[PDB]
């Protein structure tokens, strides 16, 4: 019964997980039981999503966030994002949920039964937070494992089925990506892409070649960064640049996760390659360009002269120019002219949209996909009424893209706050004034006046 | 739908994802049994 | 007096709340005011 009141730890009940900072066996069971919770939710939600699953309806019309992730991997989906076998979804639900009891056993074991600290039973597993080479050894072990995980995705993409390609010919199909981009000027040229419009930093990855080869590059620098951090100790420039505390590494991870949640929010909102609109629905960009296309289609079918047709303002109602000069979709969707989907690349020639490819060359699957993507925009309410805020309660639709971007913005902002909390605290803790100011040695009364 | 040998246990699955929300609330039951000491 | 542990009261009165607000949130989707 150490670190379990505020008499022994100096941490209250609402910061009672901070009583486990120097309890390596108990902090391990904290993390394995929590790992069991993520793998439980991965399991139980996938089962909940597949028990309440209609394979007639598209995935975005069903409030599904996890079945689209298994479907993106190339499991149980065929031509155009259509489910032909729900058993690869069910196995992912069962292998996760059953594995959660093993991590639930081992989380409960190390937390409430095992040795409270690992520093006695196993010097290999026993760690001090301020032991810098051990803290890279666990970092090197976890880097190789994420290098193993980023090579499993390459394995599923290159050997074990291929991933779903939105840019497959003739519509979307699961495609074995056999020639991935190994070129580092393309892989790391994504890193030097601007985040802003038309460039879209790494969210603009628009083919499964750079995805697989980028995960060969990430998957092997994480292995080679694991072998780096296993075989080395931190260098002297880094020892003076970091707080070496348990809460410090937490804050560095929290700040890293705030980056990742803000990026994955942007991936699910803008990218329709690694988040195919077959499964996740049209993007915000995708639905506004689909609306301009549907009425480009409808009115030219009534014989409108859509290139010369004017808006109220002088601009093209259907076809105006981007500020770089490309023929783009008229209307307010001029903000979304940097959008690339596969239902309108047969329109895009080298000047932007080709007017002669609009007149006698728009296929009925494109009219179908644009009308579907317009009426399934990622606009919706919190009670899941589809449409605008002024829409009536008939359409039970919020996109998974809206659910995924907003949840991973709520989480990613708080993880920035949690980084600011824990980075401020862990540097206040390593300097010795997180509990307050000493009255006998208050720094400001020893600090000179201002004016 | 689930595979048809699994629909007996389908009301179980319908409340299976509420379980991780209740682990958070069980830490408050466990903290209240010890009186938040 | 202190016969019943107060946490058992605090864990079932707090479970009376989520049953009722869970009943209130279910009736958002059922019957009147459900837009159906």
């Amino acid at each position: 019964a150490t670190n379990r009141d505020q008499e022994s730890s100096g941490f209250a009940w609402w910061a009672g997980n901070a009583r486990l900072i120097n309890l390596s066996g108990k902090l391990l069971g904290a993390h394995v039981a929590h790992a069991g919770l993520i793998v439980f939710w991965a399991g139980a939600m996938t089962l909940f999503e597949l028990a309440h699953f209609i394979p007639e309806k598209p995935m975005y019309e069903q409030g599904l966030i996890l079945i689209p992730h298994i479907a993106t991997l190339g499991w149980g989906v065929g031509p155009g994002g259509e489910v032909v076998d729900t058993f690869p979804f069910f196995v992912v639900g069962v292998v996760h949920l059953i594995s959660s009891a093993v991590l639930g056993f081992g989380g409960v074991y190390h937390a409430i039964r095992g040795p409270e600290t690992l520093e006695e039973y196993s010097s290999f597993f026993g760690y001090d937070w301020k032991d810098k080479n051990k803290m890279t050894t666990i970092l090197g072990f976890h880097l190789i494992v994420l290098g193993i995980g980023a090579l499993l995705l390459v394995a599923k993409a290159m050997f074990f089925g291929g991933l779903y390609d939105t840019w497959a010919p003739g519509g979307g199909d699961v495609r074995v990506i056999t020639n991935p981009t190994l070129d580092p000027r393309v892989i790391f040229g994504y890193l030097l892409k601007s985040p802003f419009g038309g460039e879209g930093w790494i969210v603009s990855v628009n083919n499964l070649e750079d995805v697989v080869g980028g995960h060969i590059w990430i998957g092997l620098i994480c292995i080679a960064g694991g072998i780096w951090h296993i075989l080395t100790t931190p260098f002297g420039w880094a020892r003076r640049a970091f707080i070496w505390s348990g809460e410090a590494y937490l804050s560095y991870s929290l700040g890293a996760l705030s980056m990742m949640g803000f990026i994955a929010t942007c991936f699910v909102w803008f990218n329709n390659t690694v988040y195919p609109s077959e499964f996740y629905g049209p993007t915000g960009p995708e639905a506004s360009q689909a609306q301009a296309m549907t009425f480009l289609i409808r009115d030219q079918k009534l014989g409108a002269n859509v290139g010369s047709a004017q808006g109220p303002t002088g601009l093209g109602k259907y076809l105006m120019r981007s500020p770089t000069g490309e023929i783009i979709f008229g209307g307010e969707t001029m903000r979304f002219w940097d959008f690339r989907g596969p239902w309108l690349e047969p329109l895009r020639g080298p000047n932007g949209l080709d007017l002669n490819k609009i007149k006698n060359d728009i296929q009925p699957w494109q009219e179908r996909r644009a009308a579907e993507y317009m009426t399934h925009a990622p606009l919706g309410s919190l009670n899941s009424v589809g449409g605008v805020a002024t829409e009536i309660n008939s359409v039970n639709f919020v996109s998974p893209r809206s659910w995924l971007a907003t949840s991973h913005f709520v989480l990613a902002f708080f993880f920035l706050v949690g980084h600011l909390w824990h980075a401020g605290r862990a540097r206040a803790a390593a300097a010795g004034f997180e509990k307050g100011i000493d009255r006998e040695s208050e720094p400001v009364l020893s600090m000179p006046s201002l004016d | 739908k689930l595979p048809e040998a699994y629909a007996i246990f389908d009301p179980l699955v319908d409340v299976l994802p509420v379980i991780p929300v209740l682990f958070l609330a069980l830490a408050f039951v466990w903290q209240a049994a010890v009186g938040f000491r | 007096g202190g016969r019943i542990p107060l946490w058992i009261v605090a864990t079932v009165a707090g479970m009376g709340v989520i049953v009722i607000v869970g009943l209130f949130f279910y009736g958002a989707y059922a019957g009147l005011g459900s837009s159906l």
Partner: peptide, 27 residues
């Protein structure tokens, strides 16, 4: 029913905590 699942799923959380209280276990 879905509720009698979620009742016994929900009740048997604090019954872990009920047993370790009425057995004076390591609560």
């Amino acid at each position: 029913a879905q509720l009698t699942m979620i009742a016994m799923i929900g009740i048997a959380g604090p019954m872990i905590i009920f047993l370790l209280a009425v057995r004076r276990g390591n609560l």
